[PDB]
Amino acid sequence: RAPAFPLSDIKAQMLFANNIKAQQASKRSFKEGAIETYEGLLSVDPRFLSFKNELSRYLTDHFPANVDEYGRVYGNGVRTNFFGMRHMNGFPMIPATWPLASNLKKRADADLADGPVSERDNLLFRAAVRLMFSDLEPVPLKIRKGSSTCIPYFSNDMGTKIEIAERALEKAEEAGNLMLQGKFDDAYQLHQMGGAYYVVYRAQSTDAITLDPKTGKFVSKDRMVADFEYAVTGGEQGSLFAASKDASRLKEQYGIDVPDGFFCERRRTAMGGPFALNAPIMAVAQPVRNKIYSKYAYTFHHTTRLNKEEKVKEWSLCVATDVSDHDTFWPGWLRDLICDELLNMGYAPWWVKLFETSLKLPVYVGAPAPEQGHTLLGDPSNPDLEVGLSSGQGATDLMGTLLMSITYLVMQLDHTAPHLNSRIKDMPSACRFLDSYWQGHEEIRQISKSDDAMLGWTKGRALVGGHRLFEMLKEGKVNPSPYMKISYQHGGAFLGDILLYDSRREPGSAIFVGNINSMLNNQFSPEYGVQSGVRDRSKRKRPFPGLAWASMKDTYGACPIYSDVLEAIERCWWNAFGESYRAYREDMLKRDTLELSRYVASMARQAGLAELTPIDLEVLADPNKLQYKWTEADVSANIHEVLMHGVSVEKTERFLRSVMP
């Protein structure tokens, strides 16, 4: 069972400093309302909604899903209905989940392992730790403009952020040693290292909606949540249940006109780490990213639809997998292991302790619903929680990638290629093998990022075992892993590019195309408003929205029905506004192209987009994509300086050298 204090308790109060930003954060009440979809257009504007009720129905009709029995996608590229867009962007289901303080029961009830099951698996996890954290070169600690330091300051000043990071890099050592000693309160008071994650509820603009041919009414995918008693008990007491996506309450509450077949948004839980403590972790995490995106680029570094295509064209079989609820399942033990293995490689203990702690931290629940929240979970005097992989941690992507790359490789040895086991006998041989495997130099292969992956087999011994494995997934009565709950993607795709199989149904004669449905998501169901109130556009969640139109053709244009869908929009837009969408988006293009030349140094006063990668555009349109789809390397140096700002390398270098071996 888990400790839980109210905002009034000192342990709560101590999480927010004596200033307005912070205090408001502690009290923050349920907040809810429409978004400025584009400049001067509301997500709920009745004209826009009509455009949506029409465009959704039309495309769903005249282009249903081309996905075969083996979750392979062919023909038109369409892998589902277009009813996702049918939400009142800006209004949550009530209530949102309370975050579960311990996933141990969740995991055992789901028949998953409490540690590496074989001595071989134990070697492979620990091998990954060594390859990944081995030969790191110090880089600048890059920071994102207009992002909250969270506990305890909640600042946004890039000024104040650097001063905080630089500080935390000097006093990181003193703070770690403090915790190795069990003086957790002490470290947090002297250097803001400790405390808690702050729970914000980001939204998921587009979730399953379907049409029941029988009734004629619409159905939103129920989304199960926990109440407080469920969250603190690990699942023991309290209840689980579907949240109320019903959007009717808006007509009475705000007298907003709600058309038939429109529902509230899904709210995903999301966390903010005490920056004091993320800084030392990112100082290592970033150099790490750099090693595996270079040396091990086959399996880890992915850019365009053709970057991926080259790799999978040489496969004889391509199985696209798909993990369930990856984050809240991530095993507490993988952390204790990764930490033990680092300690051995010769990482400073104090740093390893800071790392360990960033994973067992308490969480402040903001406001899940009206009349709720304002509660701290777990005692910060002695961090014990087992929350899964905490979304705001300094290294979340690495923890996800390391856990899953080894899970998939294991699932491959287990089911298709027993003959290789003999290559894994001790630590060095383990490493020598993994190194070859990750470079793609073996008859089995993976491309992955955390929970998206495609697994491949080339002509060889393993090859037939692959088809059996695949078959076990199509049937799907057994889970092919001990570690997580795996299965096959229905209409497979990798990092938002769909895999287009032809008549052959072979990875040699297939191609990667843009997901057309993701265009409709980025354009009519954005995650945030335009923030026309924020002067500095580099701080906005969407700095230059109009630019996405330049890089649009370049991105989705390979999609089979690109042509059609643009016309579908244009017409449905016309019907609903008495305007040309194309025009609209074109004007918006010229505007932001100019506005940009103010933010870009070298460009400017009217020079155009000539020198910019399609990526560059998509990223400037949704910098959120830089945080899951691409990375610093994929974005033109000068564009990078618009969105991020770093800490002097003379300082990361000096710090990194007291951490590593």
Swiss-Prot record:
Essential cofactor(s): Mg(2+); Mn(2+)
Sequence ranges assigned to domain RdRp catalytic in this UniProt record: 307-482
An example Gene Ontology CC term for this record: virion component
Keyword Transferase: yes
Gene3D superfamilies assigned to the protein according to its UniProt record, in alphabetical order: 3.30.70.1600, 6.20.410.10, Phage p2 RNA dependent RNA polymerase domain (1.10.490.60)
EC code(s) of this entry: 2.7.7.48
Catalytic reactions of this protein: RNA(n) + a ribonucleoside 5'-triphosphate = RNA(n+1) + diphosphate
GO terms for biological process, alphabetical: DNA-templated transcription; viral RNA genome replication
Compartments in which it is found: Virion
Keyword Metal-binding applies: yes
Enzyme class: transferase
Annotated positions binding Mg(2+): 451, 488, 492
Role description: Rna-dependent RNA polymerase part of the packaging complex that packages the viral RNA segments, replicate them into a double-stranded form and transcribe them.
Subunit structure: Part of the packaging complex composed of RDRP, P4 and P7. Interacts with P7.
Name of this protein: RNA-directed RNA polymerase
Species this chain originates from: Pseudomonas phage phi6 (Bacteriophage phi-6)
Lineage: Viruses, Riboviria, Orthornavirae, Duplornaviricota, Vidaverviricetes
Gene that produces this protein: P2
